Design a protein around this ligand. Structure first.
Ligand SMILES: [Ca+2]
Ligand SMILES: [Ca+2]
Ligand SMILES: [Ca+2]
Ligand SMILES: [Ca+2]
Lengths: 322, 322, 321, 321
């Protein structure tokens, strides 16, 4: 009755909160983490994930370093950002837990090779992606049978009404924008069930959630984990608040959906989709057949109140996830 | 207090019903019609419009023939269809009003030149487009000042959530698909207010409208106009009914919106948009900046009950448009 | 006599090409049509009208056409001050002095003029030495126009994907300026088409530079020689600063229209199309080499004959042969 | 000795190229890596292993790589039965007879093998004679791999946009088979790159066909001559039916790797990239002609030396010179 997880992540503010949720939730069993380039470099992602494990008073979970670049490494696709800090998590390396030089090293084996090996042996595990899809796509390029290895794939990324969240010249969502080829490969060639948490799920209900949930309340308990997550989210919170809104949950929702999909996904729809690669403004956009597409489940509305309750349980140490 | 209209159309089943609505509505003053290629050839469009004027017991309204092809005339863009009949309006040329050989000829002047001349002199007129945008785009190529000539442009076409209605390999809406370049030119380079009636307005409420409106009731009065519109829509109605739904209004909504926008457009949104030209699956799709775009008004929900009331008034001869 | 209509963006080499046509006794010019290109369409019009005066001619209509490319995408833009802000040396007070009326055309849009003129003169050759926008608009208005010229001679395009705009593109300049127009014209014209591609200039550039003095025809001190000296002045100075002569370009397309058998020494006939969607290859000609109507590409031209004709034009010697 | 690793799709000309490398006394083969291409990767592997036996060699590892192109888009597909369903004449019972174990590789994926082998042998040349998928996967796993080979010799691409797949494309065959891979390799490898483009074959096709008997080296009646006769049989019959000899292709890239100064008679150094997004130009090399590391293109090769080497290989004469 535990859910076995492998989480692939670019290790910035929301990623580390999402990973903390998974490390504290009693239903979750984390087999490994895999780091991918994204909002920060892959080395920094690796370091942030390892630092987060320590913050959660855990050990002996392997973190594998993966792709440094997108498949093509085209400059127009680049999504590296200092929005959350240069280090992705508040730029305070001396605060608990203090950054160590070994944090920037992985277990040894490339993430893509680790994904193959781990999921071959653990066919009942869920793979959750909360960065660009590069590691998963490289696994497929190496081993077409990997298409069947995960029990389920839960992706934070993409869209279904072409609502982009990178900039005004693209209709792509951030993680897809960061490696459009990889997203194309994964959506077309995976054979397990896929659940996508699209950008629209966040976009359309953001003003409503901002009125009804205090997204900072779980940070205030004064536990080590609360204090670490306060630091990690600090620069994101200040910048959002300067624009009159709260820094709200994103990647956390994908990890929560992995843990209990029926609880967190209030509404969902199955759609037949593919990814545009060649358009000037639409590269990285999901294209839906509303009239080589694959049927995928989209979460169209999520239970933000349950995710919030779980984060309070995680940071307070209450253990109250029911 | 009359609204002066120029209507540009490809002259198939819904076009001819829309044009009939405009010819019967006491608030509308029709300056001219312009024919464009689309679901049928431009010659057939011209013929269908002229036949429709006669069916409405009107005369002395000029019909100008326009573009035979899209700007590029690429085969992948082609939207010619026999869905409504070979002639676009039920394939019964001998029924009232009988087709005449002169129906396939226009006034003489190319439509695009007529659009320039008429709207230069009638700066208070609304231009309504219910086919591909080729004629309007050619006018702009000839005369950049045309960008200011219409008082308002009401377009039946496009989309705002990338919901396509042509086929499963495109996210474009039909009229945009038929000439993507023209749609790009018009949206970028017109300077008057633009109101677009997008495909989503029809798509999302179709099952609801199908339950609550009888779209065939206005056809049953036994007047000449009812009988003509019965013929014109006959093949569309049989094919829709064979798939368990009614043939519902489409182009009629754009003409109605031109006549009284505040009445017909129940909800609307302004968005900053451009048109994708280069994508494999997204050519012709509208791209929205949700984060060279132009601000346009989209009608997101329309009052189908008022349009239905107006069509009953038109076909019955009641004159009851209030 | 060969009847010509010349569609041009009216910069330095255009003006010299048009002068060649005005002086050559085999040519009969029906009309000029101005198109945007290296300068605005208004400036092109003005330059063409000024050039007609410098050649001691009158009563040839100049029609103003497209101000913009079909799409008017900013990445296609080819406006340049390389030959001067006015495209011909920036000395509006020198003979013939620029007049305000130079910036106006005959009245009707060039594209409508091309339809009318060529409908009535089906034995005429259309020569294009700017972007193809006017010709493409004509086709959009009138598909029958596809058959009206007896021949179309195009300065533009390429056949080995050698670009001359910048390192971001494999397109030639005139095609880069309106890729959609080039696509329409090459697919939809039905008359014989002769293209003078960029490679014809590129490959023999250094050989020509060694064997021909491209300035000598300017030395005669006639009014036309002094006008062409002015028109080409900024180009010549900029080329010489980089170790090269300012050499003929558009002149070759006009010469080819006057006597194709003499000027086109070697030719290839190819099936072609124009790429529109590529990131680096938008505007490039794409050739089917693994074997619609074949198009004739001039692969080598007789620069010495063109030079001899330009000497005759500027000197007034009549020696065209 | 020149140390080689050869990455191949294992069809008729590949097998002859590999035989050249196995017989030439200057070559030392570290390993072969199989890639999808004209046949499946499994068949490529099998063909390479069979070829090693036909050459009286043993104990050279063959690693199986990518089954598909990076994207696996159906429009890129280049699988063909032109040389037979098995790519080498469809006679599995002839010497050396096909074994079931031929379809298996050494174990580790070719891309991982390329990293390992070339990390330890930084003086080796990598030669690619199929699509570039394996090399691109290696780079995705290990950006340092960019510096591992001492040189990369690629059979593929073009420099004047002359395609050899069909009229819908300006791409060369190996590049058409995985455009993304070609883009990655040409942008991200940092070692010297020599490309043997399609134009080197195309332009001199008819001259070579007149001066070289491309079948004569098959006539010796040695086991290798009989095996290469079989391997090339269906190609030869299909070319002869169309009035042409089946001429060398991949063999030239392998020969160039063995002695680049001898085989590459003329070369050009160009800055290049690969178009991915064009409708007709996807996979085409785009060259910057208006002047990252320049790449060397072999524009003319010494077919007579390659022919002499193939005679020595099949005859057993030792006469490589
Ligand atoms: Ca993330
Ligand atoms: Ca219509
Ligand atoms: Ca010019
Ligand atoms: Ca090969």
């Amino acid at each position: 009755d535990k859910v076995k997880l492998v989480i692939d992540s670019d290790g910035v503010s929301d990623d580390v909160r999402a990973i903390s949720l998974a490390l504290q939730h009693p239903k979750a069993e984390i087999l490994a983490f895999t780091a991918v380039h994204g909002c920060v470099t892959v080395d920094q992602a690796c370091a942030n994930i390892k630092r987060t494990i320590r913050a959660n008073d855990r050990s002996n979970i392997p973190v594998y370093k993966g792709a440094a670049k997108s498949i093509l490494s085209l400059p127009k696709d680049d999504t590296v950002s200092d929005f959350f800090g240069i280090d992705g998590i508040g730029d305070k390396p001396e605060e608990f837990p203090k950054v160590e030089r070994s944090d920037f090293e992985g277990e040894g084996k490339h993430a893509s090779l680790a994904l193959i090996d781990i999921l071959r042996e653990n066919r009942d595990a869920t793979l959750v992606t909360i960065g660009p899809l590069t590691n998963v796509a490289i696994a497929l390029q190496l081993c077409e049978e990997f298409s069947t290895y995960p029990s389920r794939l839960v992706i934070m990324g993409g869209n279904y009404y072409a609502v982009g969240n990178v900039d005004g010249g693209s209709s792509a969502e951030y993680n897809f924008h960061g490696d459009p080829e990889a997203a194309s490969i994964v959506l077309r060639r995976m054979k397990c069930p896929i659940t996508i948490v699209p950008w629209e799920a966040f976009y359309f209900e953001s003003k409503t959630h901002d009125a009804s949930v205090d997204f900072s309340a779980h940070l205030k308990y004064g536990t080590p984990l609360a204090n670490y997550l306060s630091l990690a989210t600090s620069i994101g919170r200040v910048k959002c608040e300067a624009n009159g809104r709260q820094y709200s949950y994103c990647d956390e929702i994908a990890v929560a959906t992995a843990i209990d999909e029926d609880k967190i996904a209030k509404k969902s729809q199955y759609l037949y989709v593919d990814v545009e690669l060649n358009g000037t403004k639409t590269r990285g956009q999901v294209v839906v057949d509303w009239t080589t597409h694959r049927r995928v489940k989209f979460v169209t509305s999520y239970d933000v109140h349950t995710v919030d309750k779980w984060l309070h349980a995680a940071t307070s140490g209450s253990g109250k996830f029911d």
